[PDB]
Every structure is written in structure tokens, then in C-alpha cells.
Amino acid sequence: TSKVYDPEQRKRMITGPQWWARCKQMNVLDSFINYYDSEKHAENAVIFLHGNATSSYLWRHVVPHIEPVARCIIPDLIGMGKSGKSGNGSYRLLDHYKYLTAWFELLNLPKKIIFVGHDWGAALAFHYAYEHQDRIKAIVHMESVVDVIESWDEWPDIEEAIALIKSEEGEKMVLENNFFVETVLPSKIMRKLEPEEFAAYLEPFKEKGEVRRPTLSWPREIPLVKGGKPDVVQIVRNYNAYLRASDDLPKLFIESDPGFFSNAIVEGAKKFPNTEFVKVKGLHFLQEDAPDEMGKYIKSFVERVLKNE
């Protein structure tokens, strides 16, 4: 089987260098963060957080829909995109969180922030919200780390896939063979990326070896109650209980159609009160298949949240 280019895409395409040239850099702790900032309408701030394999580039066709209503800020997570590397060489959830919260202190943010999170980016937003419950205006999430995975909800294939990723063979398939960028990322986009679009995702990870570490460390954080990192399992338990009780926090969940092993994500999202549910085309990296539908849904949700405030 083969996937097909979107025959109109080369005409609104944004290449890697075009996106990076629009970004800014800021020293943060012992490193630096590369980020997009639309600047205008700073009375609000919408912070878009990518997850594994990607970067701020993931949001390039989503963010123009929301810029007219609020300042939009989109970082490359540490070790990813064009950001600096992690000073301690480590790329666990809490390492990412250290740089993200330090970076927030430098951004002149409003008291209450809107988060838009994908995959592990949503975990970062959820954990920030749990620790800063008075700083959250709304949360948009999609393909998100909503809850732990109990052992009776863990089937053998996911058990063995995580065993593989936690083994030396898993380390080599990522660091030497770039599994998550070269295979997982295009496999979970329904269209075929233009060569220049794929090159933007490849570029941070084009060389072999340790530079690819964040794309191995993220799946190793998976919150399997059986065998998963205990600190991450507790972080996710804590913010899941907070989200289940957060009746006054407006949320938007963007469901993928058909998604990819996403049923537990959708079911977990349904346990959070005050959630608007929408659906767009996609597998996992749904920004690449339905960015304008997503941007329109988020724009309408943000306008409704601001109007009702």
C-alpha cells in the first residue's frame, strides 16, 4: 500500500527553515528554548505543546486560526526541534517540565493560561495544571496521556512493545535507526507528507546516536501501573483525579477519526467534566491531516471560553 500527497499542499507548504526563521530563542536555566510567539493580543496566552517525534512545527497550520484572538506561544521541547539540549543529559517528563516551567517565568504570561496539548505535550500541560490550579483558563487536548494503564487493561502486544522499547534492541532501533521519526511518524499520518515537510521533522534527528534520545525517553515514560516509571505513574494519577473533579475548568477534546489504539484515550477523556467533544480526520498526528478543521474548532472554543468568563 502507498499513501498519496495532498495535491494542493505544495502551495501553502511551510518548510522547516521557513518556520524556524519565524521563531525566537530564549536562554532558560542552563540551556535555551526555541519557540514561536505571535505576540499580539497578550491579554490571553494559548500555549501549544507538541509531544514525541515532533516539534513546534507540528502546529504551523493550526496556529494562524487562533492568532487573531489570543497570543499563541509554541515551544520546541528541550532536546527537540531547534531548542537547546538538556543540561543533565536526561529527557524524562520531569526534565522537560523543569525547562517548561522556567521558560514560562520569562514570557510575561497572564494569570490564567490556555493550554493546547498533544501526546506527551498534554501530559506536561496536565501536570502544570495540577501544580498551578489557579493559572488555568482552559485545556484543549488530543491523543493525550489522560490516565494510567492498569495491568488488567494492558494486553500482551503493548506489554511486549514496551518491553522492546525498554531493551537494548529498542534503544538501537531509535538511536541508530530513528524508528519514531522515520517509521512511526509517517505511519500515523494519513496523507503523505511533502518531502520538505518530512525533512523538517527529520532535521533535529538527522544524525545517528544520542541526539535522538528524547524520542526514546518519551515512550519509556509510559504510565503502565505494572512496570512503568513510578514517578510518572503517580504524576498521572494525581493529575487525572484533579481533572476528573475540575468541573469549572472548560476543556476541549479533539478526537481522531479513526485514531490509532485511541479508545482508552477517548474513554479517559470522557471522565473529565466540562468537556466539549469534536472529531477530525487523522490517526495520531492529526494536525497533519486536519489542521484547518482543528484550528477552527479551537478558535471557536477559545472565543466561547473568553465570552463566558
Which residues are annotated as catalytic? 119, 143, 284
Q: How far is the CB of 156 from ligand CEI (least distance, A)?
A: 9
Distance CA 47, CA 22 (A): 16
Q: Which is nearer to ligand CEI, 63 or 181 (CB)?
A: 181
- Burial code (b: 16+ CB inside 10 Å, e: under 16) for 236-272 equals beebbebbeebeebbbbbbbbeebeebeebbebbeeb
Give the strands of the sheet with 113-118, arranged side by side.
24-28, 31-37, 71-75, 45-49, 113-118, 136-142, 251-258, 275-282
Between the two ends of the chain, the Cα-to-Cα distance in Å is 49
Please choose, from the candidates 96, 153, 85, 87, the residue with its C-alpha nearest in 3D space to the C-alpha of residue 119: 96
Q: How far is the CB of 248 from ligand CEI (least distance, A)?
A: 23
Contact between residue 240 and residue 265 where contact means Cβ atoms under 8 Å apart? no
Q: How far is the CB of 94 from ligand CEI (least distance, A)?
A: 16
> Residue numbers of the site for ligand CEI (CB under 6 A)?
145-147, 149, 157-158, 161, 219, 222-223, 261, 264-265, 268
The residues with which 141 forms a beta bridge, in sequence order, are: 117, 253
- Give the sign of the dihedral formed by CA 66, CA 9, CA 180, CA 150: positive
DSSP-derived secondary structure for 267-285: HHHTTSSSEEEEEEEESS-
Q: Which is nearer to ligand CEI, 268 or 295 (CB)?
A: 268
Q: How far is the CB of 230 from ligand CEI (least distance, A)?
A: 15
Q: Which is nearer to ligand CEI, 72 or 181 (CB)?
A: 181
Q: Which is nearer to ligand CEI, 73 or 122 (CB)?
A: 122
Cα–Cα separations (whole angstroms), residue 150 to 70, 147, 217, 223, 228: 38, 9, 21, 9, 10
Q: Which is nearer to ligand CEI, 29 or 173 (CB)?
A: 173
Provide the H-helix boundaries in 56-194: 93-104, 120-131, 156-165, 168-175, 179, 185-187
Distance CA 297, CA 159 (A): 35
Q: Which is nearer to ligand CEI, 6 or 153 (CB)?
A: 153
- Cell numbers standing for residue 200: 523538517
Q: How far is the CB of 33 from ligand CEI (least distance, A)?
A: 23
Q: How far is the CB of 212 from ligand CEI (least distance, A)?
A: 18
